[PDB]
């Protein structure tokens, strides 16, 4: 049907504003502590404490299927990435000041890709 089509043309230019908004999150984190899973061979314990573990690589792989049906989605998925770095690491360590960070600086650009899907609907 062309109302099919038509939802599936949507779904495909809010993967090209996530596409957007993943490259931009990402350029804040420099260091690139975010940019793949944390390895299972060297905190081993990990799993022990994290449950849904999260990185930019994973969510762009579930971005490059049309996995994220709605901002909010995707917000989730950014929201794990800072909030299970803060509870692994401690208060006074450069992993937990570079979630602060993070999230700090990823605000302005979901404040804003927020205002854009509102808009172009
Ligand atoms: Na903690």
Request: charged share 35%; proline share 3%.
């Amino acid at each position: 049907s062309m109302e099919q089509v038509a939802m599936e043309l949507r779904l495909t230019e809010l993967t090209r504003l996530l596409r957007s908004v993943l490259d931009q999150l990402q350029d804040k984190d420099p260091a690139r502590i975010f940019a793949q899973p944390v390895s299972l061979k060297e905190v081993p314990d990990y799993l022990d404490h994290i449950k849904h573990p999260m990185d930019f690589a994973t969510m762009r792989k579930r971005l490059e299927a049309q996995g994220y049906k709605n901002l909010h989605e995707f917000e989730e998925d950014f929201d794990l990435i800072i909030d299970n770095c803060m509870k692994y690491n401690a208060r006074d360590t450069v992993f937990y000041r570079a979630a602060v960070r993070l999230r700090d600086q990823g605000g302005v650009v979901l404040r804003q890709a927020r205002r854009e899907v509102d808009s172009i609907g």
